[PDB]
Amino acid sequence: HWGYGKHNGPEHWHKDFPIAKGERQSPVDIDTHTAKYDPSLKPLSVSYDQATSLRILNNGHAFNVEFDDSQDKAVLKGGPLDGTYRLIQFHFHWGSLDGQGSEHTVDKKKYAAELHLVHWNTKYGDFGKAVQQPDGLAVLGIFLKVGSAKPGLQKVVDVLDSIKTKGKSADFTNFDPRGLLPESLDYWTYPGSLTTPPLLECVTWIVLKEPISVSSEQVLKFRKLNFNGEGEPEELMVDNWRPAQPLKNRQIKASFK
Ligand SMILES: NS(=O)(=O)c1ccc(NC(=O)Cc2cccs2)cc1
Ligand SMILES: [Zn+2]
């Protein structure tokens, strides 16, 4: 099946998922000089105060912190979005080295990792229906650079030992995703896709301009995870990122001057 190795990696995905070569694929390089300020873009509304985290899961491609999305508890609104998008999970992509790991790039610069907070449009009833719609998902992307520790990330780091291998999960309640945000909510936005198979073209991407900083020890713990299941040959979960795809007929808009 698909993955991030030499034989099943991003260059191979198109054979099972032809949309890999589609018109609105993600991630992309954000050329800061070509992005256009859109003064009509509304401020982002991040309402995470009632967030209910449930569980953390190693799915063999990344780890997801999952949320109760059966009510409007943690929602994203505003910005380029019409309507209400519920937080269903977040996860990260990261590198084997600090100089790579992010999926989006900024003027070709790669960050050490990238956080994706995944939300779905409530007008479609459930996540499975939403991914079938061009405005079904909104993913808030946040870059990570290595420097000072991110205190709000530490709870996540400390449970990773319990979900080392594919298919392992652990209770993960009472986690506050607000602790993963940078100070500024200035963003770029463009229409795009899931960055892993099935690569569905259903995502409004909202990528924050300001990265968060995490410590070397924090990212090192990400890199101790495994792609494999328990009792299979050990393959470190690193470099689980798709490279930038062609922008094609799209304009990246900026919320800031
Ligand atoms: N890296 S990303 O674009 O944020 C992303 C988010 C979610 C998924 N996949 C799923 O949530 C699982 C799916 C269920 C039904 C269709 S895809 C893949 C990539
Ligand atoms: Zn992702």
UniProtKB/Swiss-Prot annotation:
Record annotation: effect of changing residue 103 to A/Q: Strongly reduced CO(2) hydrase activity
UniProt keyword Glycoprotein present: no
Entry protein name: Carbonic anhydrase 2
Binding site for substrate: 195-196
Catalysis performed (reactions): hydrogencarbonate + H(+) = CO2 + H2O; urea = cyanamide + H2O
InterPro entries: CA_dom (IPR001148), CA_dom_sf (IPR036398), Carbonic_anhydrase_a-class (IPR023561), Carbonic_anhydrase_a-class_CS (IPR018338)
Binding site residues for Zn(2+): 91, 93, 116
GO biological process: angiotensin-activated signaling pathway; carbon dioxide transport; morphogenesis of an epithelium; neuron cellular homeostasis; positive regulation of cellular pH reduction; positive regulation of dipeptide transmembrane transport; positive regulation of synaptic transmission, GABAergic; regulation of chloride transport
Species of the source: Homo sapiens (Human)
Effect ascribed to mutating residue 91 to C/D/E/N/Q: Strongly reduced CO(2) hydrase and p-nitrophenyl acetate esterase activities, impaired stability of zinc binding
